[PDB]
């Protein structure tokens, strides 16, 4: 099987159960709330809630944020199949995941993203799906930049025929002309600072407002 | 050997070199700046820069923040031995690390923390050292809470005889009476929200101001 599309939870190898606690909180959120937009993905989604304001942009759209740091595509797929899409009927589901899929080829990661879009199209067929491109990472040129670019080319080609599936390249140009990423935009060359989040969130908010 | 006290870098198994890029940025920071306080540890240190304001409290003390998400004690020890203490002469070094030392016993983690204090006492003998207790984690009672408590008891006993070594329990009581941690304080039951950071930062700032 493609490991990126075989749904599985993140196994607890530490002992505090925190990943399942997070998923269960999100299942209870979907049980108790009626969002128009649900966001799901990895830390780039999760820390937007905190580390961008979120409140200025996305709160007024009636949104839930199911980002979890460290998730790969198959973990997001499992969470969507195991309660986080129940009891709700969102207009838009925003997906941002794949940069953590270490050991999967770009084609495998793309298959994971396609499986997520297909699951959302089955369980929540009224919703449009937005998929964000994977951002560049690392301070200098490196294989994960090339991998993430290739995922983005394959995902964009896969969604091009798909009316209510929308690919969004939210990258304002974080890789400069000298090949570097600034720590002012990504403090550890992966995770966005508040400054890094501003252009990303504005691009995503403009698209969401269009679609809504 | 105790693996917690054997200095080693975090090996890059992903391919973007981001951990070494972070360490090299901190080495360049120590080369170019003259801090009075340097903070080093794991994400609980790192995200205080962002996710608490930091600017209100710690910026005026002339501080560098060398936190890196995911580091264990042996990684902080290696970074301190491999350039992050050069060219500087701080008054205080703040250490907060050990919650990520999975697979090490509490006694081993305590040995890692003692090795960090000893290295700082050799390389920067004028500095006082502040060690923060490891915080509770997980939504409900679990073995890592007990482990972290035991580390804190052993570290506090180790530092008690040590004039300019200071143990700080910065926990305002995150574990409630029903055994839970709220996601309002730790959004993923490990990492602090802005709200979680407030009491921690105030306790640490009060001690730093005393000592300074």
Curated annotation (Swiss-Prot), chains A, B:
InterPro entries membership: SGNH_hydro, SGNH_hydro_sf
Record keywords: Acetylation, Cytoplasm, Hydrolase, Lipid degradation, Lipid metabolism, Phosphoprotein
Keyword Disulfide bond: no
Enzyme Commission code: 3.1.1.47
Localization terms from the record: Cytoplasm
GO CC annotation: 1-alkyl-2-acetylglycerophosphocholine esterase complex; cytoplasm
MF (Gene Ontology): 1-alkyl-2-acetylglycerophosphocholine esterase activity; platelet-activating factor acetyltransferase activity; protein heterodimerization activity; protein homodimerization activity
Superkingdom field: Eukaryota
Activity regulation summary: Beta subunit (PAFAH1B1) inhibits the acetylhydrolase activity of the alpha1/alpha1 catalytic homodimer.
Active site: 43, 188, 191
Coiled-coil segments: none
One of the Pfam families matching this protein, by short name: Lipase_GDSL_2
The reaction(s) this protein catalyses: a 1-O-alkyl-2-acetyl-sn-glycero-3-phosphocholine + H2O = a 1-O-alkyl-sn-glycero-3-phosphocholine + acetate + H(+); 1-O-hexadecyl-2-acetyl-sn-glycero-3-phosphocholine + H2O = 1-O-hexadecyl-sn-glycero-3-phosphocholine + acetate + H(+); 1-O-hexadecyl-2-acetyl-sn-glycero-3-phosphate + H2O = 1-O-hexadecyl-sn-glycero-3-phosphate + acetate + H(+)
Keyword hit for tRNA-binding: no
GO BP terms in the entry: lipid catabolic process; spermatogenesis
Assembly notes: Forms a catalytic dimer which is either homodimer (alpha1/alpha1 homodimer) or heterodimer with PAFAH1B2 (alpha1/alpha2 heterodimer). Component of the cytosolic (PAF-AH (I)) heterotetrameric enzyme, which is composed of PAFAH1B1 (beta), PAFAH1B2 (alpha2) and PAFAH1B3 (alpha1) subunits. The catalytic activity of the enzyme resides in the alpha1 (PAFAH1B3) and alpha2 (PAFAH1B2) subunits, whereas the beta subunit (PAFAH1B1) has regulatory activity. Trimer formation is not essential for the catalytic activity. Interacts with VLDLR; this interaction may modulate the Reelin pathway.
Known function: Alpha1 catalytic subunit of the cytosolic type I platelet-activating factor (PAF) acetylhydrolase (PAF-AH (I)) heterotetrameric enzyme that catalyzes the hydrolyze of the acetyl group at the sn-2 position of PAF and its analogs and modulates the action of PAF. The activity and substrate specificity of PAF-AH (I) are affected by its subunit composition.
Sequence similarity: Belongs to the 'GDSL' lipolytic enzyme family. Platelet-activating factor acetylhydrolase IB beta/gamma subunits subfamily.
Extra remark: Originally the subunits of the type I platelet-activating factor (PAF) acetylhydrolase was named alpha (PAFAH1B1), beta (PAFAH1B2) and gamma (PAFAH1B3). Now these subunits have been renamed beta (PAFAH1B1), alpha2 (PAFAH1B2) and alpha1 (PAFAH1B3) respectively.
Name of the molecule in the record: Platelet-activating factor acetylhydrolase IB subunit alpha1
